[PDB]
């Protein structure tokens, strides 16, 4: 019995183009703990990406938050790429 991660991609503050913010990717409800998370900018992986330590839910599943400082623009497309034993291929979730 393995649980697939829920992936949520949102900004810290309501986004305004040209205004510095943080892009968050909240990965949760997954089991087992082994997980790979990458933040993408125009399909390419972002190097300066920070994350929380693996966290524990009362339902026995785990969660983490991956974030990067960014200045949204009309042109730039952002996404969160996740891999877990429950996934055949890595899952790319786009930011609205």
């Amino acid at each position: 019995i393995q649980r697939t991660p829920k992936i949520q991609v949102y900004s810290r503050h309501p986004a305004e183009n040209g205004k510095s913010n943080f892009l968050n990717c909240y990965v949760s409800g997954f089991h087992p703990s082994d997980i790979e998370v990458d933040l993408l900018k125009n399909g390419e992986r972002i190097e300066k990406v920070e994350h929380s330590d693996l966290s524990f839910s009362k339902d026995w599943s785990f969660y983490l938050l991956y974030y990067t400082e960014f200045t949204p623009t009309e042109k730039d497309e952002y996404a969160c790429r996740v891999n877990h034993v429950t996934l055949s291929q890595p899952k790319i979730v786009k930011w609205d």
């Binding site: 393995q2 949102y10 968050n24 089991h31 087992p32 082994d34 330590d53 693996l54 966290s55």
Partner: protein
């Protein structure tokens, strides 16, 4: 005061990947990590500045030794479970201990174990017994229930010790844990969105002509914003209004 809680988790992994620790134990006061321990660092370390500032090296030194022991115990207990399950490969073992101090002054205490992320053994501190999910859990239940004094010890820890630690940690973290940051709520095309609030506990709903109908509503998760605050949403001729409840303040946004 609002409802507060103290929880400690333990995670044991048999056969881990290169790097991944065999054992991790983390403590929380509500949504806040307070302490951490793993089989790689082999040290109990603070996860909140108000824990670091309020507990002397002696505390961290003592508990580092206890966690080294608790780590070994978890290895042996997982070995027993995997053998009796007759399982191969990497399997998980988890423990969650904790308590809550409710707004009314009443308390709760809990202790449970899981194998492969599923409920395995659940302690009942009122009947001093362990609820077993299957025969492997039933074999362990009989062994733990044969040590009557440990069940008594556990009842006392959950009811007395745990509460005292929680009250102590609440005072240390008061500026963080007892504060209120009201939400900023907006309605857009229908989406009701809130952000910048603390504590994470909020209720958001949509009313169609002053009647709820919770089935016709899609609720978003309470998500960490990354700055110590949270965000959430709820989506849906009739009159629609968004209702937001946070720390004893009710809010209405008419559309």
């Amino acid at each position: 005061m609002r409802t507060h809680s103290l929880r400690y988790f333990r995670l044991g992994v048999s056969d881990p990947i290169h790097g991944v620790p065999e054992f991790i134990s983390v403590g929380y006061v509500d949504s806040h990590p307070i302490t951490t321990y793993d089989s790689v660092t082999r040290q109990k370390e603070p996860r909140a500045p108000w824990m670091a500032e309020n507990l002397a090296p002696d505390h961290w030194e003592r508990y580092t030794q206890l966690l080294r022991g608790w780590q070994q115990m978890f290895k042996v207990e997982l070995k027993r479970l995997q053998r009796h399950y007759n399982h191969s490969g990497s399997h998980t073992y988890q423990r969650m201990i904790g308590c809550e101090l409710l707004e009314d002054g009443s308390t709760t205490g809990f202790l449970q174990y899981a194998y492969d992320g599923q409920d395995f053994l659940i302690f009942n501190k009122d009947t001093l017994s362990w609820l077993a999910v299957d025969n492997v859990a039933h074999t362990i239940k009989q062994a733990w229930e044969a040590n009557q004094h440990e069940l008594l010890y556990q009842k006392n820890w959950l009811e007395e010790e745990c509460i005292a630690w929680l009250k102590r940690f609440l005072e240390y973290g008061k500026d963080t844990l007892q504060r209120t940051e009201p939400p900023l709520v907006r309605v857009n095309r229908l989406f009701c969105k809130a952000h910048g609030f603390y504590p994470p506990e909020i209720y958001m709903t949509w009313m169609k002509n002053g009647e709820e109908i919770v089935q016709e509503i899609d609720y978003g998760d309470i998500l960490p914003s990354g700055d110590g605050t949270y965000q959430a949403w709820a989506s849906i001729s009739n009159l629609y209004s968004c209702h937001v409840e946070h720390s004893g303040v009710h809010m209405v946004l008419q559309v």
